Amino acid sequence: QDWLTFQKKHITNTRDVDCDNIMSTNLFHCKDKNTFIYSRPEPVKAICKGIIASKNVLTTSEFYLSDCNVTSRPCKYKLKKSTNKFCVNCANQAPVHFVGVGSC
Ligand SMILES: Nc1ncnc2c1ncn2[C@@H]1O[C@H](COP(=O)(O)O)[C@@H](O)[C@H]1O
Ligand SMILES: Nc1ncnc2c1ncn2[C@@H]1O[C@H](COP(=O)(O)O)[C@@H](O)[C@H]1O
Ligand SMILES: Nc1ncnc2c1ncn2[C@@H]1O[C@H](COP(=O)(O)O)[C@@H](O)[C@H]1O
Ligand SMILES: Nc1ncnc2c1ncn2[C@@H]1O[C@H](COP(=O)(O)O)[C@@H](O)[C@H]1O
User: Fold this and answer.
1) Which of 104, 98, 102, 99 is nearest to 12 (CA)?
2) 62: number of CA atoms within 13 Å, CB side?
3) 9: which residues sit within 8 A by CB, 6+ positions away?
4) Number of domains composing the chain
5) Which residue in 22, 39, 97, 101 is the catalytic one?
6) Is 9 annotated as a binding residue?
7) Which domain holds residue 30?
8) What is the distance of C-alpha 81 from the center of its chain?
9) Residue 10 is part of a domain; what is its CATH number?
10) Is there a catalytic annotation at residue 10?
């Protein structure tokens, strides 16, 4: 919805995200899935430089991604680590929503 919330929802300072902990917090509230980008925020913000009006943008190269995917046990997850391009909604020069991995 905005850059600060995007960072909280989608940028991790560890590849080894503790999914069962973080996904249970208010921001994620035990939802099925969330993708985190294992990176410092600066190169992530740069994806959207100069983009004013809302537009989906696929990154030009790959980043390290840590996905929390729910199992069939309520609010218990498995972590998956990978690299890929990813797509974000850019608005006012910052990522404000995570769209997808590999494609918009
Ligand atoms: N067009 C869409 N329809 C349904 N879900 C979407 C769409 N675009 C993005 N999402 C999902 O929204 C979630 C991320 O939203 P957010 O955490 O608010 O950035 C991800 O699970 C996305 O897969
Ligand atoms: N472009 C989009 N179109 C429709 N729904 C979306 C889109 N982006 C995010 N969402 C919805 O917002 C949810 C995530 O928002 P939040 O719960 O605020 O993290 C996802 O499960 C999606 O259903
Ligand atoms: N979870 C999601 N994340 C990102 N994009 C989505 C998601 N679910 C649906 N979409 C996109 O939203 C559009 C409509 O999806 P659908 O409801 O499957 O017809 C399509 O362009 C899908 O690729
Ligand atoms: N970019 C996307 N990310 C996540 N889920 C998606 C995306 N595009 C479509 N979907 C959902 O994934 C499922 C695809 O169904 P199908 O096309 O029958 O394999 C539908 O529930 C779509 O809403």
Assistant:
1) 98
2) 8
3) 27, 28, 34, 98
4) 1
5) 97
6) no
7) 2-104
8) 13
9) 3.10.130.10
10) yes
Task: Tell me how many degrees the CA angle 15-79-58 measures, rounded to the nearest 5.
Answer: 65
Tell whether residue 81 is among the known ligand binding residues: no
Cα 104 to middle of ligand 4, angstroms: 12
What's the Cα-to-Cα distance from 27 to each of 7, 8, 31, rounded to whole Å?
12, 8, 9
Q: What method did the depositors use to determine the structure?
A: X-ray
Strand ranges in 8-101 using DSSP code E only, listed in sequence order: 11-12, 33-38, 55-58, 63-70, 77-84, 86-91, 94-101
Structure token digits, residue 87: 């797509």
Q: Enter the tokens of residue 86.
A: 């990813």
Q: Which two tokens stand for residue 5?
A: 């919330």
Distance, CA of 7 to CA of 60 (rounded, Å): 20
CA of 9 to the centre of ligand 1 (A): 12
In Å, what resolution does this model reach? 1.6
Give the containing element (helix H, strand E) for 4: helix 3-10
